[PDB]
Structures are given as C-alpha cells and as structure tokens.
Amino acid sequence: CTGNQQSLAHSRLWDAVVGFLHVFAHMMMKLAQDSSQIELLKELLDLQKDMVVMLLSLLEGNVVNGMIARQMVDMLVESSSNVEMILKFFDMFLKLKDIVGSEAFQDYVTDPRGLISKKDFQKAMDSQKQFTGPEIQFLLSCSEADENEMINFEEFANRFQEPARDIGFNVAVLLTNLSEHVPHDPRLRNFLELAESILEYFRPYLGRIEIMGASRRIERIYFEISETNRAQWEMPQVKESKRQFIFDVVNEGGEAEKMELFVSFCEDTIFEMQIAAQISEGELEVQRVKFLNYLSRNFYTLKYLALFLAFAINFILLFYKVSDSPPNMVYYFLEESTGYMEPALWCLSLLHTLVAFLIIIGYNCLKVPLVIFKREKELARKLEFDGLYITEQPDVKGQWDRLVLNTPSFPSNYWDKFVKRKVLDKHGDIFGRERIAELLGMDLASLEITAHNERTWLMSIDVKYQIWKFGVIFTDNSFLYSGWYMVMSLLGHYNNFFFAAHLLDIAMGVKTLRTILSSVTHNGKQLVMTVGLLAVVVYLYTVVAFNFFRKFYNKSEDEDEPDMKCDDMMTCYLFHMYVGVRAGGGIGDEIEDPAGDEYELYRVVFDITFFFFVIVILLAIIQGLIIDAFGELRDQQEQVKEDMETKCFICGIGSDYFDTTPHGFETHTLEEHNLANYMFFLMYLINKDETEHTGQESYVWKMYQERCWDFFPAGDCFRKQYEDQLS
Amino acid sequence: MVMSLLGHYNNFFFAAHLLDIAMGVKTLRTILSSVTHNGKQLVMTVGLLAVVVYLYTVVAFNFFRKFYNKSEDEDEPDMKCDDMMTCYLFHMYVGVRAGGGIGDEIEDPAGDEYELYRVVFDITFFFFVIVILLAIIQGLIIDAFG
Amino acid sequence: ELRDQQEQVKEDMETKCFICGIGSDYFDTTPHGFETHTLEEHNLANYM
Amino acid sequence: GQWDRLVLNTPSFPSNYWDKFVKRKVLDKHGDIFGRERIAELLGMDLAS
Ligand SMILES: Cc1cc(C(F)(C(F)(F)F)C(F)(F)F)ccc1NC(=O)c1cccc(I)c1C(=O)NC(C)(C)CS(C)(=O)=O
Ligand SMILES: Cc1cc(C(F)(C(F)(F)F)C(F)(F)F)ccc1NC(=O)c1cccc(I)c1C(=O)NC(C)(C)CS(C)(=O)=O
Ligand SMILES: Nc1ncnc2c1ncn2[C@@H]1O[C@H](COP(=O)(O)OP(=O)(O)OP(=O)(O)O)[C@@H](O)[C@H]1O
Ligand SMILES: Nc1ncnc2c1ncn2[C@@H]1O[C@H](COP(=O)(O)OP(=O)(O)OP(=O)(O)O)[C@@H](O)[C@H]1O
Ligand SMILES: Cn1c(=O)c2c(ncn2C)n(C)c1=O
Ligand SMILES: [Ca+2]
Ligand SMILES: [Zn+2]
Ligand SMILES: [Zn+2]
C-alpha cells in the first residue's frame, strides 16, 4: 500500500533509523568484550534483523529509480561512519572462520590440548595480510586470556557466527537490492566492495527470482535457501526425474500445462525429498527398518552386482556339450578344468535369485509412494476442481479409481488430508449433501460432529485401500519389468537357460539400445499394417499359383516321391511366405525354369512382379519404417538440447535479445530465471508460517493455493520494462 | 616411420605406406572419421547383434540341434550345434551373412515335427537381424557420413 | 513425402489463424492468447 | 593436469611462452594467502635468493 509508504517517507523515520544505526554500531563493539555479555547481544541482532525487513517491506512495490530508493541510500551515507563499523564487524568476524581453517596456524599451535597461545596466534593473524593492526588486539580482547596461552580458536570461530547468521545474510539482501535497483551510485560501489565477504558467504544461500504481479510489473524477489534444501536437491535420484521432466515437457507438452506440470513436478520432487529425508541415516520393527534403510541406500548398486553375476552365469553356461552316455541325451558340462564351474554356477544362480528379490524390495520401498502419490494427487485435484464423479461421469483408470473414495484414508500420501471436506462443502447442496457424504464415506453429521473440531500395522490394515494400491502399482510399467526380471531369475533354477534371460537386461538399460527397442513400438500401428499388406500380397500371389502354376511347384528331386507343395492351398501359401520373401530373387528363383513354352511368358511376368512388388518395395518400406523410427527418436533428444540453449523456458524470449552483451543470455538464465530458484521459492513458502509472508510472498502464495498461473513472467524479464532506465 | 622401417623385414609392409593415400585425401578422411564419430553408439549396436544372435543360438541348442547337420557325408556327422560355443559361432559366422537368414542354410522343415515353430524361427531370425540391425548399422555409418 | 504433407497441416493449423495470416507469437503475449483468438475471434465455423 | 604437475619445479618452465616472468607473478599474487615459502618450494624459485 503506497499510502503508508508515502507517509513513512515523509516523517523523521530515517532520522529515527539513523539514531538506531548509531546505537547499533557502538553497542556491539562494546558488548563484544565479554562472555557474560552474550545473552544481550543475541537480542540486538534479532532486533536489527526486524528493522531491515521493515526497510525491505518499505522497498517493495519499488520502481527502478524511485525516491524511496534514493532516500534509502543517502540515509545510509548520512550514517556512513557507523554503517561501515557494523559492516567491518561483519567483515572481520567472517574471515576469522576462513583463516582458522588453514593449516598454517594449526601448525602454529603445538599444544596437544588445542589451547593456542595468544601471542602465538597474534603473529598468526599478523602473518596473513588481510586483517589490520588494530584488529588483532580487538580480537585478543575479544578472546579469553586464560593465563595468556589459551584462546581456544575452535570455539572462538563459531561463537559469534550462529547468532549473527541471518542478519548478515539480511543486510546483504538490502545492499544487493538497492544496488540492483538504482544504478550509478559510487557510494554503493564503495559499499559493495566494503562488504564483499558477506556477499560471497551469502550468495549460495541466497536465491533470486522474478515474478510479475501487482498490476503488470516484474520485480526481483529474494529469499533464504537452507543448507538442507540444497543438499537433497543435488541428488541423482532427484536429478534423473528432472532430466526426464525436461524431456517430456518441451517435446510433447504445450505451453499451457508447462507451468501446471512444473508445479506438479515441483510437488513430486518435493515429495521424493521428504521420503529421502525419511530414509536418511521387540526391535523387530527396528531391525526391519535398518534392513530397509540398508537396502534402499545401496539400491542403486545392488543392480550392478545383479548385472555381473548374470554376465558370469553365462560364460559358464557357454560351456555345455551333449552326449548319450552321461559322464536319454544327458546334458552336462565340458569341465574346462578350472575351479569347478558347476559349483560356481549353482552359487551364482542362488545369488542371482537373491540379489533380485533384494532389487524388488528396494523398488517397493522407494518408487511406490511417488506413484501412489501421483495417482492420489491427480485424483483428489480432478475431484475438488473439476468435480469428476459427483457432477460428471467417466477410461479404465477412472473406473478403477472409483473404489477408494469410500476408503477411510483416501489421501494417504497427498499431503492434503482435508480434501474430503472441501469437495463436500463446495458441492454441499447442488448434488445432495447426504448423498455426497455417502459417496465419500464421510459419515456427514457424525463426521462434522467429530470431537476434534469441538474438543501393529497388520492389526488394522485396511483391505480395500490395499487392493486399490496394488491394482494401481500392477498397472505400472516399471514394476512389471522388475516382476518379469524376478520371475525369470526364479524360473532359472528350473533350467539355467533362464539365466540367459537376465543376461538380456544389458539391452533394455543401455541408452543407444533402448532407443532401438522403442522404435518398433513407436509406430507399430503403422508397421503391423505393412506386414499385413505383405501377408495379403503374398496371398494373392499364392492364389494364382494355385490356379495355374501348380505344375511347376515340385520341390522334390526324387523321381518317385512327388512333393507338390502347391496342392493344399494352406500349404502353398506357407511355402511362399516361408521361402518366398527370403529368396532375395523372388519366388521364381526356387522353381523350375519356364523354358517350356506353355505359359512361359506369363510366368516370366509372375516371377518379375513377385520380386519387384514384394522384395524390392515392401521388404524395403518395412526396413524403411524401422530405420526411420530410429532416426526421429534421435532428433527428439536433439531439439531439447538445442532450445534449452536458445529459449529461457520461463519466458519465451530467445537468446538474441540476451546476446546484446557478453553472457547476456547466460547471466539471464543463471540468475534471472533459474527454475531451481522457483522450486526453492515454493519450498521456502511451504516452510515458513503464514503470518510472516510479506506482501509479494503472500500474494504469490494465495495465487498458488487456488491454481492460477498468472504470476510467471511469460513475456518480459526486467529488461524490457526497465531496459532504458538501467545501464 | 615404424611401418616403413619394418618393411625391410618383409616388403608387404611397403603396402602399409601404400595406405597413406587414404588418411590425407579429404573425401576419404571424412569416411574414416565417421566410424569413430559415434562409436559409443555403434559398438552398442554391434553388441546388440551379438546378444540377439546369442538368444537365437540358445533356442537352437535346446530344440533344433537335430537340423544342424551341415555335413553331406552319410557317415561323418558334423552336428555343428552340439558344443554351444560352436553353434553360436556357426550362427554369427554364416547367420548374418546368409542374406536370407539362418533358415537358408539348414534342412527344410517339411517334417511336421516342429515344422511351424521352425517356420517362425527362420522368419524371425531373418527379420529382426538381417532386415533391422544389419540395416541400422549401415544406417549409422551412412548417416555419420552425411 | 506423403507422410509430411499430412504433417505440415497439423503444424500450421496450430501456428496460423487460417483467416488472418498472423502467427501464434502475436497471440502468445498472454495465456491462451492464440487459443482464445482462434476459439472466438475467428472460428471458421462461426463464418459458415 | 597430473602429468603437467611435473615441470613447475623446472628451471625453464616458460620455454616457448614468451612471458618468462610468470614465476614471480603467481607467487606475488598469492604471496601470503597460501604461504610464500611454500609457493617458492612448489615453483622451485628459491624465494629469498
Ligand atoms: C547395471 C546396468 C548397466 C548397463 C550398461 F549397459 C550401461 F551402460 F547402461 F550402464 C553397462 F554398464 F553395462 F554398460 C545396462 C543395464 C544395467 N542393468 C541394470 O541396471 C539392472 C540390473 C538388474 C536389474 C535391473 I531392473 C536393472 C535395470 O535397472 N534395468 C533397466 C532396464 C534399466 C530397468 S527399466 C526397464 O529401464 O525400468
Ligand atoms: C602427398 C599426399 C597426397 C594425397 C592426395 F590424395 C591428395 F589429393 F590428398 F593430395 C593425392 F595427391 F595423392 F591425390 C594424399 C596423401 C598424401 N600423403 C602425404 O602428404 C604424406 C606422405 C607421406 C607421409 C605422410 I605423414 C603424409 C601425410 O601428410 N599424411 C597425412 C595423412 C595427411 C598426415 S595426418 C594423419 O593428416 O596428420
Ligand atoms: N530457464 C532456463 N533456460 C535455459 N536453460 C536452462 C534454464 N534453466 C536451466 N537451464 C539449463 O540447465 C543447464 C544447467 O547445466 P547442467 O549441466 O548442470 O544441467 P543438465 O545438463 O540438465 O544435467 P545436470 O545438472 O544433472 O548435471 C544449462 O544447460 C542450462 O541451459
Ligand atoms: N482459425 C483457426 N486457426 C487455427 N486453427 C483452427 C482455426 N479454426 C479451427 N482450427 C482448428 O480446429 C481444431 C479444432 O479442434 P478439433 O479437434 O475439434 O477439430 P479436428 O482436429 O479438425 O477434428 P474434429 O473436430 O472433427 O474432431 C483445432 O486444432 C483448431 O486449432
Ligand atoms: C509435501 N507437501 C507439498 O508438496 C505441498 C504442501 N503444500 C503445498 N505443496 C506443494 N504441503 C503442506 C506438503 O506437505
Ligand atoms: Ca505478517
Ligand atoms: Zn526469462
Ligand atoms: Zn485472426
């Protein structure tokens, strides 16, 4: 609201702030000289944290060159000599941790207790040339004396770091906000170099983002990112979902759902991260949980020991021979005279059947939730928004899903556990409350009569919900492939040739191969037709042979024994389709010459036409289709890599508009619109309270809690509105 | 230099310098870099050929050993498909080069015993290998040239 | 080629208006801009 | 890189790269931050002398 931000811009509020600036720079530098003064100083840092966030919330709704920004900067330079004293206090107490991490001063202490001598550590700071002369006696006075041989550099590093943590980040926000807001202020240029160390210690934990709300203006929004949110973001199990999410959105997804899939992806990744935090490192439950944690943690590598074994049980098997007298036919092993192979074969079989099971359990305990999360989310959301069932009517998927609504735990992974009430209330009467409570199993009256508002897993394991979950998982594809790998492994103990069907998983995983495997199924609906066309053409050329050319079809040399393959038309047709399309010269290559004048010319056309139509055209098209489907699937993976280096993926502005300066597009992508920044912003919003969301924060949040996507830039990024007014 | 020097050992080595015409002559040097341009995705295709011919060797070693008698002599039986390490080499040697698939080099399935199954074995070995993969490869090669 | 003539159609019908020769970019400066434009401004069904 | 980490001690590291004073430059610019004497030992400069 401007009407308050105008009145605050015209009082003596700056002159109030200047007095608060002068008391802050002098209270700390007096209070930093005792251990028994530290209780007071933590309160002071939390106070000026709340002061500068008032300055930030005063500087929201800010234009690039506005007088509020200009009254902010001269007030900082009317309060110069103290505001560097607070800046140098942040600057000295941050390099103190980075200096003491060097081994040059751990070598300067020879005490095994760690109690470094004061004058010894005094010349240590005098050895490095970054601090000043008065700084070390300021630091020696900050240190404890303890018979002048003990400063205890370890506790001295982190003592004044954790209470000074958020405020040192927060002051860097305001400095980098205003410097990004107004250009050409050399006092700010004096300020930014004076506070360089607090920038780089608080640049990775910072994140920038740019949203456009509040009557068509984009503005830089800033936030904190924890160490924990960046730790479980740079995991490959999270990253593999992203690389797929990059693919199927820019390839087949339109510009509309791009953002809707993005926040859905932001929902799903946030999920996997919760369940990865769940598994991060009488007692039957405890032992089993340790077992599961061990499994899932190794899960990525337990697949490699399954691949090895399987490539070994083969090199062994590749040594079978057959004979009558078993040293009827008795399959046995060559016995190459190495370590007894049979024994090792049995051992590896066992293993390959165990290390499969423990590949199934891992999948069940890792990738299941994120699927029974994707289903629950999508369902509930297409329920309380589109009113799928109560108003409209369904898709085998939908019919199957119309089974858990009665369940007492419908939202079992979808965080929102109140999606029951919402739908009822929003269609309360329109479709009959009691009817809706019956459909959803809420128990209406008693439900709302729940005392909550007013005032042994096997033991109670709901059956019906388990049935729904198993149905949906068995409907999954990747679980079916792991079920097939288990079933083949198990069946292998029946006959080791089945340990030659795991041998085959090298293929379905090895990238360049997996493409060649999807080629067939990519357009089978238009390759099966071609095969069928081959079947019908060979049919038509079989019928004529069965009406006029039966005479020639005698593939038996024996004078007496006549074969006459072309008598039972079901036999002639198979003869053609078996040795016809494989002759390479057509059918006429496998029958007697037409030298006989009888129908000689007609057969001379039958041969040539069968060859040309089939073995030159169709046995070509097919190959054609195949090779092609292999080429296109090698381009869909190309266009992505192309455009991700050409478009911003948030706004549809190419790289040319950001090529009018070095690293223009690069910098734009790297800080203006890193989508990682957006996904972090979503987590930061979800984490903090509601009573603390600032204006723009609460605004974007409340436009998210009802699924409106008008707060993404999509058309201009802070260099099309203010391009002229900023250099 | 090493080939030239070794040539004095046996003049056929003066047929390895003969080959430098190639590595310098532009239009050729391209054809030579084609193979190494994407070998990481052509070696995989070869390997896929190896594995498919393997899978079609195993079935022949479990049900079709009977047919694999490439020796005409009445007495002397060859039976190439007895030592699986022998049957697999027989396939990978005269299989992918038949141009009509493996079924072009064995006795006819006229015998009703497993006649239909062999009529599918032949056609599938031909289609999957000699029409698809021995095509892709050529494909990869020609492309890398384009 | 006969598999591309059927491609270009599906491409451009999602790129041009078919009544005015204005692409989808000019109607991309707002959500569903091109979509709304096609759906009410120029549904040729409306003309017929 | 590992192989290149062999000539830094050599008395003639910049043998074709015209700049033959690239020894001093690096020392001076990281003079203390990483220990002069340590850097002179790494680069075979013989610091003081
Ligand atoms: C380890 C491995 C390496 C290679 C390499 F080719 C590559 F280059 F790709 F890495 C090689 F390293 F060998 F060179 C190929 C496949 C595997 N196999 C598995 O990961 C594995 C093992 C057992 C059970 C299952 I399930 C799997 C497994 O995850 N399979 C699939 C096919 C990837 C599962 S899916 C159908 O994609 O969901
Ligand atoms: C003279 C010549 C002509 C032709 C013509 F084909 C062309 F049209 F290209 F000019 C021809 F004139 F014959 F038509 C082709 C190759 C040569 N060979 C050499 O230059 C030669 C000789 C000996 C040792 C070496 I080393 C070379 C030589 O430089 N080789 C390479 C292969 C170019 C060296 S590299 C691997 O490229 O570094
Ligand atoms: N808004 C964006 N516009 C264009 N490209 C983007 C955008 N956001 C991220 N990227 C892309 O993300 C990539 C970041 O580099 P990086 O290699 O780390 O990611 P990756 O190639 O997908 O694989 P990974 O990060 O897992 O190693 C860059 O290619 C960068 O272009
Ligand atoms: N003026 C127009 N510009 C671009 N596209 C148009 C225009 N008018 C109609 N269309 C196209 O007509 C299609 C309407 O969707 P719809 O699927 O119903 O038609 P269809 O795909 O041709 O087949 P059918 O309507 O018979 O089911 C949209 O793809 C829409 O882009
Ligand atoms: C896991 N999770 C989310 O993913 C989420 C949320 N609110 C919004 N989202 C996206 N809550 C409360 C939540 O617990
Ligand atoms: Ca508030
Ligand atoms: Zn952008
Ligand atoms: Zn129009």
UniProtKB/Swiss-Prot annotation, chain A:
Ca(2+) binds at T691. The modification Phosphotyrosine is found at Y553. Residues 570-589 dip into the membrane without crossing it. This is Ryanodine receptor 1. Caffeine binds at W415. Homotetramer. Can also form heterotetramers with RYR2. Identified in a complex composed of RYR1, PDE4D, PKA, FKBP1A and protein phosphatase 1 (PP1). Repeated very high-level exercise decreases interaction with PDE4D and protein phosphatase 1 (PP1). Interacts with CALM; CALM with bound calcium inhibits the RYR1 channel activity. Interacts with S100A1. Interacts with FKBP1A; this stabilizes the closed conformation of the channel. Interacts with CACNA1S; interaction with CACNA1S is important for activation of the RYR1 channel. Interacts with CACNB1. Residues 493, 547-569, 590-609 are lumenal. Residues 103-131 form the EF-hand domain. The calcium release channel activity resides in the C-terminal region while the remaining part of the protein constitutes the 'foot' structure spanning the junctional gap between the sarcoplasmic reticulum (SR) and the T-tubule. Pore opening is mediated via the cytoplasmic calcium-binding domains that mediate a small rotation of the channel-forming transmembrane regions that then leads to channel opening. The N-terminus is blocked. Channel activity is modulated by phosphorylation. Binding of [3H]ryanodine indicates that the heterozygous channel is activated by Ca(2+) concentrations 4-fold lower than normal. Single-cell analysis of cotransfected cells shows a significantly increased resting cytoplasmic Ca(2+) level and a significantly reduced luminal Ca(2+) level. Residues 364-469, 511-525, 631-727 are cytoplasmic. Cytosolic calcium-activated calcium channel that mediates the release of Ca(2+) from the sarcoplasmic reticulum into the cytosol and thereby plays a key role in triggering muscle contraction following depolarization of T-tubules. Repeated very high-level exercise increases the open probability of the channel and leads to Ca(2+) leaking into the cytoplasm. Can also mediate the release of Ca(2+) from intracellular stores in neurons, and may thereby promote prolonged Ca(2+) signaling in the brain. Required for normal embryonic development of muscle fibers and skeletal muscle. It comes from Oryctolagus cuniculus (Rabbit).
